Design a protein around this ligand. Structure first.
Ligand code: ANP
Lengths: 50, 408, 153
């Protein structure tokens, strides 16, 4: 809803299969340090439990 | 102030937009400085019936019944018909200076003490225009100073007249104003339908708390309108009211149709104008001349506000507020049909009313009342089933427990 | 009087009728409505506008022998007299007219009956229902393959 990115439902057999399409206003960073950190800050891959 | 303003505008329009195109207005602290680069009143001699030889601008500014607007009505495009206006401006002013350059000379008229002092002088110069700077008489009017609501009036009038005439550029206290009919229509209502011609420009909007209008004959603010808006609104309504009668079968009366509009009408380049007063607030011209001059397609306005539900559907819903609101059926689409007082489903014992040890069973369904009919004592034990699912009890008003069937 | 189908009026300034109107009549509706509209609002809890109750009435007034009357028209159809002279000479007590038209039910009753449909109206509740009349709903609760539209099997 921010307009940053869009997604489409293509869920497979094992796990998930969602296909993510990048729009133009976002960081679109490089160097594979800050783009991955922006992914785990934005897509929420890193999850913490107790 | 409007007399000097329309004198500058008439000087602009008498030369077909080539002089007096820059009119500067400066009204701050009881002093008015209004100038334009027109031809002005020339140095040519204008005679008096008394026999005295009085020059041009001083006879235009001090003596009434003087002007170049006393010509034929079939050719004149200016709104002036009196000759008394700048004398009316100068009489109620305690200080006045006025300069008119004609391209060869400046003629400066200084007036004071309510036509006890007036003096005209001729200075050599190369100016071509008119400038009037006066300080008004506060012992005649019911005021002592000038307030900002009059300056708001002057600013809105200059905005309006700039929308009427975009060739003439007006500046109020050194501040320029642009004139567009679209921004003037959209200051009014956001859905005001515009309709422009070579001599006409009319926008239709909304008036929710009465009726609103602002119509212009040439260069005069006709706050009371005239025959022009009568003929144009009859031409719009004679296509509009049968169209809404075909639309939603409600015969809305003509006052009720036209009561929900605001109209921005600016008319340019008209001839043979007639107003019934020196106030000049309303047009008494014959409708034949106005109808021959106006070539505005009013049916375009009728079809352009017919489909516009932002204006028309408030009128039709007010008709629904007085006719479909009178079309009363009083339901809530729950089950519709007849509003029964008491349904036929009823089990009544013979002790319905007396003081005894009887009971009523509010049991469930026709099964339990079938077993209850096969079981109970006719004198002692009663019964009643329930029709079905009942909702939450305290979300509903006591008149709506009265609207509920099984509770009743 | 009464007027169910538009605005009607009758004005005489001294011996001269104004069929268009004037400024003493604005004082007469002002002094009548300033005592009437809060009284009707306290009486039947209704909020009807000044134009909506102004178009429902006709007023017939006769005015005799008042000074410095002013007319901008050659037919003298608009009394342009100032409000100070009008309010100084017209000593018409409008509160007795307001309480006299308050006691007459020949005007307010069908309008109040129409208002009773909404104002002080019995509640209904029950199943109001709703005709949303479906929707397109293409992307919701359906499976979209990547060949949605292309020539395939
Ligand atoms: N500053 C001025 N600029 C141009 N013409 C002027 C000026 N002052 C006076 N006049 C002339 O003198 C008249 C002013 O008196 P006025 O009563 O305005 O006459 P009118 O224009 O014939 N009538 P009206 O505008 O309806 O009041 C105008 O008709 C002009 O011809």
């Amino acid at each position: 809803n921010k307009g940053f990115i869009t997604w489409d439902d293509a869920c497979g057999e094992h796990g998930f299969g969602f296909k993510v399409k990048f729009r133009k206003e976002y960081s679109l960073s490089d160097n594979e340090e800050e783009r991955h950190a922006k992914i785990m800050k934005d897509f929420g891959l890193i999850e913490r439990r107790s | 102030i409007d007399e000097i303003i329309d004198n500058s505008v008439d000087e602009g329009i008498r030369t077909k937009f080539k002089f007096a195109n820059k009119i500067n207005v400066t009204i701050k602290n009881n002093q008015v400085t209004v100038e334009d680069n027109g031809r002005g009143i020339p140095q040519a001699m204008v005679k008096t019936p008394t026999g005295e030889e009085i020059p041009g601008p001083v006879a235009a500014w001090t003596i009434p019944k003087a002007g170049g607007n006393f010509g034929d009505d079939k050719e004149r495009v200016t709104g002036g018909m009196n000759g008394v206006g700048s004398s009316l401006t100068n009489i109620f002013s305690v200080m006045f200076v006025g300069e008119t350059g004609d391209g060869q000379n400046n003629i400066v008229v200084r007036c004071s003490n309510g036509m006890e002092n007036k003096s005209w002088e001729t200075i050599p110069g190369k100016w071509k225009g008119t400038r009037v700077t006066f300080i008004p008489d506060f012992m005649s009017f019911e005021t002592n100073e000038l307030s900002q609501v009059y300056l708001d009036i002057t600013l809105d009038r200059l905005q309006t007249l700039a929308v009427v005439y975009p060739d003439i550029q007006f500046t109020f206290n050194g501040k320029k104003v642009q004139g567009n009919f679209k921004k003037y229509a959209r200051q009014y209502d956001e859905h005001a339908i515009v309709q422009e011609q070579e001599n006409c420009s009319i926008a239709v909007g909304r008036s929710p708390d009465g009726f609103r209008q602002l119509t212009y004959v040439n260069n005069i603010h006709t706050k009371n309108g005239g025959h022009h808006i009568d003929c144009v609104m009859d031409d719009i309504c004679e296509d509009l009211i049968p169209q809404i009668k075909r639309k939603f079968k409600i015969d809305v009366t003509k006052a009720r149709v036209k009561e929900c509009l605001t109209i921005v009408m600016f008319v340019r380049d008209m001839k043979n104008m007639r107003f019934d007063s020196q106030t000049k607030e309303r047009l008494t011209s014959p409708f034949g001349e106005i109808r021959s001059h106006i070539q505005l397609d009013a049916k375009k306005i009728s079809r352009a506000i017919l489909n516009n539900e932002a204006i028309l559907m408030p009128i039709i819903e007010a008709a629904l507020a007085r006719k479909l609101a009178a079309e009363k059926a009083a339901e809530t689409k729950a089950a519709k049909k007849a509003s029964k007082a008491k349904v036929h489903k009823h089990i009544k014992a013979n002790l319905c009313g007396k003081d005894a040890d009887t009971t009523l069973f509010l049991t469930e369904g026709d099964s339990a009342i079938g077993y209850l009919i096969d079981v109970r004592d006719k004198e002692l034990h009663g019964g009643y089933p329930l029709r079905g699912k009942v909702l939450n009890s305290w979300g509903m008003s006591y008149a709506d427990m009265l609207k509920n069937k099984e509770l009743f």
